[PDB]
């Protein structure tokens with residue numbers, strides 16, 4: 001798709017057998033999702049850094065479908081105001097900024 | 100340009116007679132820049148909301164050049180860890196997400 005930016009670029013994703021919505025966020029290095037039980041191995045990761053850090057679970061090589069595009073990438077799972085698709089998965093789906 | 104997202108989408112801007120760098124951030128509703136003296140009228144605005152709010156100065160209808168595209172838009176000026184071009188000015192330059 002070509003997504004204009006008059007509204008927040010929220011897309012449908014499928015992850016861990018669930019449908020969810022997430023924000024395509026070119027300001028975010030990493031993808032951070034709230035409340036998903038993913039199977040397989042993880043390690044704790046400290047993110048943010050303003051006011052303290054937030055600890056999330058880092059799952060590598062997670063299959064995820066983003067606006068119909070089936071890809072693989074690292075997903076951080078933990079508390080986030082909104083589900084965010086970061087650059088790490090936008091590269092995988094071949095998403096570019098164009099003007 | 101077509102900008103891939105393997106690296107942070109940092110671009111050159113010209114604002115208030117200065118050259119600066121800023122991050123094209125589709126997760127940000129608004130444009131927030133640090134340390135610019137803009138002429139003309141402003142009003143205080145509270146932004147953020149996590150941990151408290153941050154107060155910035157809102158300047159409406161500011162001429163700004165973004166990666167060579169001369170546009171007009173609202174610029175919030177105050178303390179930010181990174182200069183950020185938000186959706187409000189990405190729409191003006193005709194920037195879309197494509198995949």
Ligand SMILES: CC(C)C[C@H](NC(=O)[C@H](CCl)NC(=O)C[C@H](O)[C@H](Cc1ccccc1)NC(=O)[C@H](NC(=O)c1ccccn1)C(C)C)C(N)=O
Nearest residue numbers: 027028047048049050081082084126127128131147179183
């Ligand atoms: C270092 C900490 C500030 C947090 C850390 N930050 C980052 O990764 C980067 C800056 Cl290093 N943040 C961003 O790029 C801002 C980002 O677009 C996030 C979007 C988001 C992410 C997660 C949940 C809810 C919303 N925030 C914003 O765009 C905006 N928030 C802001 O504080 C803000 C400040 C200055 C300029 C623009 N925006 C707002 C519209 C919500 C993180 N792990 O998310």
